[PDB]
RNA sequence: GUUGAAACAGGGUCAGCUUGCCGUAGGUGGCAUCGCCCUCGUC
């Protein structure tokens, strides 16, 4: 019940309305947010950081799910609206040219195909014309707080249109349906069942998503690579017959659990905990309020469900806690 | 005779380079074994 209980918990937290991913999204921490108008025109380089003692990468936002880059020719991935700082302005402080310009080309091709596949929106058109103007992207570097996003690497950039100032370009009721259909019709034409945690059909989720929060890099939880990690010659990903509608759910659940109030590490291991809500545990997650008060009592309402104490390493996630009691 | 196969915790490194328990000092200023008794009480 590694991902079975996690899937059941996600099916409980998703239908509770409390800031969680769905279909094909994920709560990503975007540092600097770019605000424009209706037709390109870079007009604001806003930043929403300043949280803890260290300047985190901005607030959390429900962006489309990351397709999982990390590779040589990594520009062939080309995410939807959110990516790296070399996919928007083709800038590279330590990445270099050529390799970063092709990333911008792939990103503008992606936004162009999204525009031609979903027109009349006053949102995707702005980001599509912003990358094909060749006069505002250079102005982005000459903003007001641009000298701060260059000293820190891994700066994610998002787009926010005008007449909203609260919803990103990937938040209006238009591209959300496209992203939901991508993980419903496009991401369902592959290998058949049977699933691993749901027992139903579901396509075999090849190339599992990456979990951000455990390690410095988005470390994938369960992912088979190399060669000896195969059972019967499944060759990368097919070793675990896990469906998309469950792998995505567990990855998004680990992402939401590695960035909220339940995220706390005792020492080189993040021992995140949760409950069944039928959460309100106030026992394991209550290990960092203010000055450690006395909240332990006996109200005959001790919820069940175990806790997953996972630890990072290089880019994998190691499981060490397993106890239903 | 068609069934978990492959796994190293290691490659390896002086806990010391070192340090006076020491300058510090009267067991003493001071007190009768005595105030007392036949080895014959017998021969």
The separation, in Å, between residue A17 CA and nucleotide B32 C1' comes to 112
**Cβ of A314 near strand B (distance < 7 A):** no
Q: Is there a contact between A198 and A44 (Cβ–Cβ < 8 Å)?
A: no
Distance A268 CA to B12 C1' (A): 24
Task: Classify burial at A258, counting beta carbons within 10 Å of its beta carbon; exposed 0-12, middle 13-18, buried 19 or more.
Answer: buried
Note the CA–C1' distance, A77 to B28, in angstroms: 101
Quote the CA–CA distance of A212 and A220 in Å, as a whole number: 8
Are A68 and A26 in contact by the 8 Å Cβ rule? The answer is no
Rounded to a whole number of angstroms, the distance between the first and last alpha carbons of chain A is 14
- In sequence order, the β-bridge partners of residue A28 are A61
Instruction: Tell me how far apart the alpha carbons of residues A236 and A258 are, in angstroms, rounded to a whole number.
Output: 26
- Taking a C-beta distance cutoff of 8 angstroms, is the pair A237, A249 a contact? no
Is the CB of A231 less than 7 A from some atom of nucleic acid strand B?
A: yes
The overall longest dimension of chain A from CA atoms, in Å, is 65
Closest listed residue to residue A310, CA positions, set A201, A199, A186, A219: A219
How distant is the alpha carbon of residue A6 from its chain centre?
17
- Determine if strand B comes within 7 Å of the CB of A232: yes
Report the C-alpha gap between A85 and A155 in whole angstroms: 6
258-287 on A, CB < 7 Å from strand B = none
Which nucleotides in chain B lie closer than 7 A to a protein CB?
4-7
Elucidated via: cryo-EM
């Amino acid at each position: 019940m590694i991902l079975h209980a996690l899937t059941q918990y996600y099916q409980r937290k998703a239908e509770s309305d409390g800031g969680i991913a769905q279909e094909g999204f994920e709560n990503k921490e975007i540092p600097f947010i770019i605000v424009i108008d209706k037709q390109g025109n870079f007009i604001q380089l806003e930043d929403t950081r300043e949280l803890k003692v260290k300047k985190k990468v901005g607030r959390t936002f429900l962006v489309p799910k990351g397709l999982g880059r990390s590779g040589s020719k990594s520009y062939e991935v080309s995410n939807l609206l959110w990516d790296h700082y070399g996919y928007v302005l083709a800038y590279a402080g330590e990445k270099g040219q050529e390799q970063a310009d092709k990333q911008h080309a792939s990103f503008t091709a992606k936004v162009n195909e999204l525009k031609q596949a979903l027109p009349d929106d006053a949102g995707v058109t702005a980001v599509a014309a912003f990358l094909s103007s060749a006069e505002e992207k250079s102005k982005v570097m000459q903003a007001a707080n641009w000298a701060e996003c260059a000293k820190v690497k891994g700066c994610n950039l998002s787009f926010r249109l005008v007449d909203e100032a609260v919803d990103l370009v990937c938040q209006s009721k238009a591209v959300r349906e496209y992203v939901s259909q991508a993980n419903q019709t496009q991401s369902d034409n592959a290998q058949k069942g049977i699933c691993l945690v749901t027992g139903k059909a579901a396509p075999i989720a090849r190339l599992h998503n990456a979990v951000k929060g455990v390690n410095a890099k988005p470390a994938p939880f369960a992912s088979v690579n190399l060669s000896a990690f195969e059972s019967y010659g499944k060759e990368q990903g097919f070793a675990f017959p896990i469906g998309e509608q469950a792998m995505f759910e567990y990855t998004t659940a680990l992402n939401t659990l590695l960035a909220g109030e339940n995220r706390f590490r005792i020492g080189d291991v993040t021992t995140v905990c949760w409950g069944a809500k039928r959460a309100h545990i106030d026992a394991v997650k209550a290990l960092y309020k203010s000055l450690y008060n006395g909240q332990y009592c006996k109200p005959d309402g001790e919820d069940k469900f175990y806790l997953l104490g996972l630890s990072p390493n290089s880019a994998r996630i190691v499981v060490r806690f397993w106890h239903e009691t």
